[PDB]
Amino acid sequence: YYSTSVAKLIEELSKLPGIGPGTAQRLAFFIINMPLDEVRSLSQAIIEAKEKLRYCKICFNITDKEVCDICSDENRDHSTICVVSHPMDVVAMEKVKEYKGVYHVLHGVISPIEGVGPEDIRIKELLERVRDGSVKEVILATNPDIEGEATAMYIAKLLKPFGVKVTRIAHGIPVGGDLEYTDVVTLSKALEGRREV
Amino acid sequence: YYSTSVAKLIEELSKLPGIGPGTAQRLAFFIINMPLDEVRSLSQAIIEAKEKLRYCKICFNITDKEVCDICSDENRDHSTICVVSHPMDVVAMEKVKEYKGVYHVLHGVISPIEGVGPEDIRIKELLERVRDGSVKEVILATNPDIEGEATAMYIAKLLKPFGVKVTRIAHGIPVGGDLEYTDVVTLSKALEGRREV
Ligand SMILES: [Zn+2]
Ligand SMILES: [Zn+2]
């Protein structure tokens, strides 16, 4: 079949997302052909990322320290909080280079097979950050999904009673998109949200 | 090479957009194999569409009559005009099923190799429709292009001095899009345009 070990690697690698049995092989071999120092590194890396991983006690983003890097920054507005459902969403948001607020990851909002060793949702703490802080606005940056919606709504409900300006990220036509082509839904929301001048 | 006629058809067909030399052949043969009545139809069709074509004297959309079907409808708000740069944009807009205004195609806004037998731009008439009508709003439904912009702007300028509410179609994240994935620009506009609650 396959050298019992090489067999093994293929299995591990295949368990990965988007990594199919074919591309699995190609990689097993590259790896195996790689230089033992290079190989070690790929290996330390994979394991140390798992144990070291931790979740900011302030915003619940992924990070390696007790409190995340954004949070403990100082050069950033801790009075605008950008709400988000999944930690990658921050890395998306964060390549914007023109946002200066902090964030809040609601976790178990996306709870597919969640609670993986104890992954639970964080709405309560979002409130207490607002209920007990001095927050100006709360930007909901969640999916135009029918799932991204209803979060945006719900949460706008829990926050409305406070003094905060709750706002949602804009839905419509992507920069460099063509309405000639766009989805009707899309372009249908694109209508609903037309803004003066 | 190719039966001189079959040769010919391939040439004509290839002149078409997105129709490449290979797919050209496949079609030539299907066609040629098609039933002479079916073939005639494809043929009448192609030519009659060209001559019959005409441009609504009211909104400058493509149509076969002297004035377009929307325009002469009655069941539609002729006081909301949806501005657009290219007649397909209307067919996009029009599958929305929740717009009840009329439109205006600015033509030579998209003037690539325009003036094809006399295709010229229609901004002036957009004004006179407003300057001499009773129009409530003017929805600019143009591309998040850097080209779609500047139209939206310019035209909002020409109309501002009137009483009209000028509004632009919304830019951001497509319905069923994922900001985890979206373009930075996109998602960067998606920020700029955040709307309360
Ligand atoms: Zn943090
Ligand atoms: Zn018309």
Author numbering:
A (entry chain A), B (entry chain A): 0 to 196
The authors write:
RecR is the most conserved protein in the RecFOR pathway; RecR binds to RecO, and RecO interacts with SSBs, then the complex facilitates RecA filament formation on ssDNA-binding protein (SSB)-coated ssDNA. RecR is a zinc metalloprotein, which consists of a helix-hairpin-helix (HhH) motif, zinc finger motif, Toprim domain and C-terminal hydrophobic region. At present, the HhH motif is thought to be required for binding DNA, the zinc finger motif plays a structural or DNA-binding role and the RecR Toprim domain is the binding site for both RecO and RecF. In this study, we investigated the structures and biological function of Thermoanaerobacter tengcongensis RecR (TTERecR) and its series mutants.
To investigate the significant difference observed in TTERecO binding after mutation of the TTERecR Lys21 residue to Gly, we solved the 2.8 Å crystal structure of the TTERecRK21G mutant. The space group of TTERecRK21G was F222, with only one monomer in the asymmetric unit. Four crystallographic symmetric TTERecRK21G mutants formed a ring-shaped tetramer similar to the full-length TTERecR structure. The main difference between TTERecR and TTERecRK21G was the positional change of loop. The offset angle of TTERecRK21G reached 90°, suggesting that loop plays an important role in the binding of TTERecR to TTERecO. Moreover, we found that mutation of Lys21 to Gly in TTERecRK21G only lead to slight deviations in the polypeptide chains. However, this slight offset resulted in the helix-α (residues 143–163) moving 3-4 Å away from loop, breaking the interactions between the helix-α (residues 143–163) and loop. The distance between Tyr153 and Pro117 increased from 3.25 Å to 20.88 Å, and the distance between Glu146 and Ile112 increased from 3.45 Å to 13.01 Å; these shifts induced the loop to offset by 90°. In the crystal structure of TTERecRK21G, the loop (residues 117–122) flipped 90° away from RecO and lost their interaction with the link region (residues 78–88), the helix-α (residues 87–99) and the helix-α (residues 228–234), which are all in the hydrophobic pocket of RecO. Based on this analysis, we speculated that the Lys21 is required for the interaction between TTERecR and TTERecO, and the loop in the Toprim domain is the most crucial site for the interaction with TTERecO.
